[PDB]
Design a protein around this nucleic acid. Structure first.
Ligand code: MG
Ligand code: MG
Ligand code: MG
Ligand code: MG
Ligand code: MG
Ligand code: MG
Ligand code: MG
Ligand code: MG
Ligand code: MG
Ligand code: MG
Ligand code: MG
Ligand code: MG
Ligand code: MG
Ligand code: MG
Ligand code: MG
Ligand code: MG
Ligand code: MG
Ligand code: MG
Ligand code: MG
Ligand code: MG
Ligand code: MG
Ligand code: MG
Ligand code: MG
Ligand code: MG
Ligand code: MG
Ligand code: MG
Ligand code: MG
Ligand code: MG
Ligand code: MG
Ligand code: MG
Ligand code: MG
Ligand code: MG
Ligand code: MG
Ligand code: MG
Ligand code: MG
Ligand code: MG
Ligand code: MG
Ligand code: MG
Ligand code: MG
Ligand code: MG
Ligand code: MG
Ligand code: MG
Ligand code: MG
Ligand code: MG
Ligand code: MG
Ligand code: MG
Ligand code: MG
Ligand code: MG
Ligand code: MG
Ligand code: MG
Ligand code: MG
Ligand code: MG
Ligand code: MG
Ligand code: MG
Ligand code: MG
Ligand code: MG
Ligand code: MG
Ligand code: MG
Ligand code: MG
Ligand code: MG
Ligand code: MG
Ligand code: MG
Ligand code: MG
Ligand code: MG
Ligand code: MG
Ligand code: MG
Ligand code: MG
Ligand code: MG
Ligand code: MG
Ligand code: MG
Ligand code: MG
Ligand code: MG
Ligand code: MG
Ligand code: MG
Ligand code: MG
Ligand code: MG
Ligand code: MG
Ligand code: MG
Ligand code: MG
Ligand code: MG
Ligand code: MG
Ligand code: MG
Ligand code: MG
Ligand code: MG
Ligand code: MG
Ligand code: MG
Ligand code: MG
Ligand code: MG
Ligand code: MG
Ligand code: MG
Ligand code: MG
Ligand code: MG
Ligand code: MG
Lengths: 88, 275, 114, 68, 100
RNA sequence: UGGGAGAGGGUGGUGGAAUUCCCGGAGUAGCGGUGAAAUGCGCAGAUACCGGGAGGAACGCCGAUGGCGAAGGCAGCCACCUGGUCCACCCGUGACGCUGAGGCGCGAAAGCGUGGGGAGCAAACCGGAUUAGAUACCCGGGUAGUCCACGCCCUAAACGAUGCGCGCUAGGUCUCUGGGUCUCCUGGGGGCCGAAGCUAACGCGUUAAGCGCGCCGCCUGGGGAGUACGGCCGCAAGGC
């Protein structure tokens, strides 16, 4: 799975301030971490449709946060997706 | 995985080709080829003895190492996987740390860069070769000798394999590609794994032309001939067989067994093929 | 002639078959509901099994059998009466064990067991 | 006579504890019901799984013939 | 890494030379597959509940190891190639669960 | 952040019981099957028994009125990869929410395509019974199929015949799973009986079919008919 270290590294890199843990940035970053590991998982495990439902649910979650961050701060929105390789 | 064509001609509608994905080198080792003397199906009397042969693409014969107990203990690196027009398997080029180069038929799962070795002590891994008696029961295996030192005779075509089933005395029991169960001497060499290019049987030739490239001339039915030619020859209009279906030479061809009855190897065959 | 052996009671709803073997399991003699004269569904009655066990025990004792271990398979009617007949025959019943085969959920059974 | 009361402390995951696990098996070899072992739902599942591992190692049997 | 237990049953009718050779094969493989032995219990011969490979007993080994997650399946495959290894079972080490 | 339970899913491996078949041994006059029978099998040595081998499928006890999943559905055991979900802390964000025409994905069994596999079972089929007849029920055989990979099909009593979300309105009892301080209390599931209330009745009742708000789907007499025509989808069967 995803180690505890790996997750903290992601939180540090996107935290808006010292102890920040649930910012829209930190949320889109953590979901992106899971989305990309599930996508790679599903490429080999093409018949794992049940876990694929988890993917759609994640992607929809990240999408709603991104639309929120786009409505509140367009600059912060564009930088987050560019910092993560999103929107294609 | 066989490749398909769009139907931009009548023949391309169904034609399929090998994808040639394992092939990493497109020219043979010069020192390991010699001319393959085309026969047309004719013997040293000049007489056709196998009908409907000839006119296929020119080919060079690649010398294949069907012994391998030749070089016990000397490892080799799998340098390349190549096309061989003289067989359905692909062939793998081996670079021995000796410096000697030889060809083996390419097993399923072989990788260029891996090493292989032959001998009583070789690890049970794809591409290694051992006397049968040292391969664990249950292992699927190929390029099996039939008698010791006489050269690999069994399980050489694309996708085929033999399975070790048991041991009795000096002998090992194999399930040959035909499903026959056969004792084979334990000192006979085999190579672990199955032969590669397993999709060979899914090739759809597609058109008459493609058989011709392979040296297969048209086969003409006995029923299309005259009585001088064939048991099924003659009759006004179409005709059913009118007799037990026979070969051009008169022997029956629907079920009549033809293995010689008093053959010494019968003592070593346990169960005739299935299916 | 061997004096120690085995008695198998294959007892189904249609018949009861008794086979008397040696210590290694090699049959010495056998009987059944048919050998004692019955046909049809009578072969699956307890009295049938009784005559069969006695006729099997009698033959075995004719070869010097004196002691047997008893192996029982199947849940047929004449199962319990077959054990009786062996004990009350003359043979020495050293033991009785039930070895009825039972799949750990194996092959799909015929329609009539579903 | 419930089996768990006949035993002090034991580890419900010790698949090698042949001498404790074997008490949770009927004389015919079967895994005993919760009514005769005295375990709750949660621990009976651990027991059953452990017995199964021990069976695969050859410590515990899958079935025994019933002797009258 | 993760901690596992490597149960292994061997041909009980070997001699201590053949047996020490099998233990040698096993010890290298563990090392070769990145497995660091922590403890090891060797109960030896032991009557089995049922014949394994037609023998009523089996020679028992056991190692707590620490090894990387992705190599355990391959390790158990290699531990099984020898004709004398009748059984292998690599269980994820877990905490005890106690009753009473 | 720190924990839990679980037949949730995917991949590779692996265990024992049983059936059938093949070989060896031992043995003989029947076995099998039914309501009773016959077909069938058996002196060319069957059944029953012992030893060895091969092979496929399904996993006994545990197992429950149990668990998990969005539904279909999921059950030997080991490992890896992976989804959902609950709890305690009350630490971060600051309404970021609910629903959802279209779209996209999933979707039991049967069926289809290509290849593999085939022990048991078993449509079609053949035969024996039963019977007034018996294109059936019961019996003896038996091919697809059932199993695996990949691609299609997209249906159902796909049911709780009960769309999703939120708030509100006595309790009692059994149970699964967490956290307490473990008497008991408190969350989340799963049942039963019931307050008020609802309901044509049956019944429902904090797992509402009660009292309310939001949004979606759907009904408008029976037959004709889920038929025809059109269109879209499918290799076809046929689906919408
Ligand atoms: Mg999510
Ligand atoms: Mg967006
Ligand atoms: Mg390919
Ligand atoms: Mg084509
Ligand atoms: Mg093309
Ligand atoms: Mg194309
Ligand atoms: Mg055409
Ligand atoms: Mg055209
Ligand atoms: Mg090509
Ligand atoms: Mg190729
Ligand atoms: Mg030269
Ligand atoms: Mg030259
Ligand atoms: Mg030549
Ligand atoms: Mg020539
Ligand atoms: Mg000449
Ligand atoms: Mg001449
Ligand atoms: Mg010719
Ligand atoms: Mg070739
Ligand atoms: Mg080819
Ligand atoms: Mg074909
Ligand atoms: Mg073809
Ligand atoms: Mg050619
Ligand atoms: Mg031809
Ligand atoms: Mg022709
Ligand atoms: Mg003519
Ligand atoms: Mg002539
Ligand atoms: Mg003539
Ligand atoms: Mg003439
Ligand atoms: Mg003639
Ligand atoms: Mg003619
Ligand atoms: Mg004619
Ligand atoms: Mg003619
Ligand atoms: Mg005519
Ligand atoms: Mg003519
Ligand atoms: Mg003609
Ligand atoms: Mg014609
Ligand atoms: Mg004619
Ligand atoms: Mg004809
Ligand atoms: Mg004729
Ligand atoms: Mg001839
Ligand atoms: Mg020969
Ligand atoms: Mg009967
Ligand atoms: Mg082994
Ligand atoms: Mg433990
Ligand atoms: Mg957590
Ligand atoms: Mg025999
Ligand atoms: Mg005779
Ligand atoms: Mg037998
Ligand atoms: Mg049950
Ligand atoms: Mg339930
Ligand atoms: Mg649930
Ligand atoms: Mg807070
Ligand atoms: Mg604030
Ligand atoms: Mg929604
Ligand atoms: Mg929709
Ligand atoms: Mg479906
Ligand atoms: Mg199906
Ligand atoms: Mg089907
Ligand atoms: Mg059809
Ligand atoms: Mg078909
Ligand atoms: Mg099919
Ligand atoms: Mg067709
Ligand atoms: Mg097929
Ligand atoms: Mg068949
Ligand atoms: Mg009929
Ligand atoms: Mg009639
Ligand atoms: Mg009539
Ligand atoms: Mg009939
Ligand atoms: Mg039938
Ligand atoms: Mg049948
Ligand atoms: Mg058909
Ligand atoms: Mg078909
Ligand atoms: Mg639909
Ligand atoms: Mg229901
Ligand atoms: Mg529901
Ligand atoms: Mg409906
Ligand atoms: Mg209705
Ligand atoms: Mg709706
Ligand atoms: Mg409504
Ligand atoms: Mg509670
Ligand atoms: Mg508690
Ligand atoms: Mg409740
Ligand atoms: Mg009620
Ligand atoms: Mg009231
Ligand atoms: Mg109302
Ligand atoms: Mg209540
Ligand atoms: Mg209340
Ligand atoms: Mg609920
Ligand atoms: Mg209502
Ligand atoms: Mg109408
Ligand atoms: Mg329609
Ligand atoms: Mg319809
Ligand atoms: Mg139409």
């Amino acid at each position: 799975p995803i180690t505890k270290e790996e997750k903290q590294k992601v939180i540090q890199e996107f935290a808006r301030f010292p102890g920040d843990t649930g910012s829209t940035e930190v949320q889109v970053a953590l979901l992106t971490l899971r989305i990309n590991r599930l996508s790679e998982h599903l490429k080999v495990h093409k018949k794992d449709h049940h876990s694929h439902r988890g993917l759609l649910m994640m992607v929809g979650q990240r999408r709603r946060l991104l639309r929120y961050l786009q409505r509140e701060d367009p600059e912060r929105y564009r930088a987050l997706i560019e910092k993560l390789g999103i929107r294609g | 995985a066989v490749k398909k064509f769009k139907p931009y001609t009548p023949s391309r509608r169904f034609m399929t080709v090998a994808d040639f994905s394992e092939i990493t080198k497109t020219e043979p080792e010069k020192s390991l080829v010699k001319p393959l003397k085309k026969t047309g199906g004719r013997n040293n009397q000049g007489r056709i003895t196998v009908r409907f042969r000839g006119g296929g693409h020119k080919r060079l014969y690649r010398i294949i190492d069907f012994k391998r107990w030749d070089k016990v203990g000397i490892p080799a690196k799998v340098a390349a996987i190549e096309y061989d027009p003289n067989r359905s398997a692909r062939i793998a080029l081996l670079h021995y740390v000796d410096g000697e180069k030889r060809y083996i038929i390419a097993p399923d799962g072989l990788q260029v860069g891996q090493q292989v070795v032959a001998g009583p002590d070789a690890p049970i891994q794809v591409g290694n070769a051992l006397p049968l008696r040292f391969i664990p029961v249950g292992t699927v295996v190929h390029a099996v000798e039939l008698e010791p030192k006489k050269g690999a005779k069994l399980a050489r075509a694309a996708g085929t394999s033999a399975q070790i089933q048991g041991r009795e005395g000096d002998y090992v029991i194999l399930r040959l590609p035909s499903g026959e169960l056969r004792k084979v001497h334990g000192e006979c060499y085999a190579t672990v794994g199955a032969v590669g290019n397993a999709d060979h049987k899914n090739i759809v030739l597609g058109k008459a032309g493609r058989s011709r490239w392979l040296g297969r001339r048209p086969h003409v039915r006995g029923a299309a001939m005259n009585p001088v030619d064939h048991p099924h020859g003659g009759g006004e209009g179409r005709a059913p067989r009118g007799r037990p279906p026979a070969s051009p030479w008169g022997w029956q061809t629907k079920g009549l067994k033809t293995r010689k009855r008093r053959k010494p190897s019968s003592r070593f065959i346990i169960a005739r093929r299935k299916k | 002639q061997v004096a120690s052996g085995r008695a198998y009671i294959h007892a189904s709803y249609n018949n009861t078959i008794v086979t008397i073997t040696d210590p290694d399991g090699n049959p010495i003699t056998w009987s059944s509901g048919g050998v004692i004269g019955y046909k049809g569904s009578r072969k699956g009655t307890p009295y049938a099994a009784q005559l069969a066990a006695l006729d099997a025990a009698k033959k075995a004792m004719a070869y010097g059998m004196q002691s047997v271990d008893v192996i029982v398979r199947g849940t047929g009617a004449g199962r319990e009466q077959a054990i009786r007949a062996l004990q009350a025959s003359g043979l020495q019943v050293k033991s009785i064990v039930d070895d009825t085969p039972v799949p750990h959920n194996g092959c799909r059974p015929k329609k009539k067991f579903r | 006579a419930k089996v768990k009361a006949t035993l002090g402390e034991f580890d419900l995951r010790d698949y090698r504890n042949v001498e404790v696990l074997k008490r949770f098996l009927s004389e015919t070899g079967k895994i005993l019901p919760r009514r005769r072992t005295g375990l709750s739902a949660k621990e009976q599942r651990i027991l059953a799984k452990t017995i199964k591992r021990a069976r695969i190692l050859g410590l515990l049997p899958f079935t025994e013939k019933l002797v009258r | 890494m993760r901690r596992y237990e490597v149960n292994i049953v061997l041909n009980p009718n070997l001699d201590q030379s053949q047996l020490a050779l099998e233990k040698e094969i096993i010890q290298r493989a563990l090392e070769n597959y990145g497995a660091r032995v922590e403890k090891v219990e060797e109960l030896g011969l032991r009557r089995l509940a049922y014949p394994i490979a037609k023998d009523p007993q089996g020679y028992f080994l056991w190692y707590q190891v620490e090894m990387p997650e992705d190599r355990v399946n391959d390790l158990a495959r290699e531990l099984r190639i020898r004709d004398n290894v009748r059984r292998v079972m690599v269980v994820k080490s877990q905490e005890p669960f106690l009753a009473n």
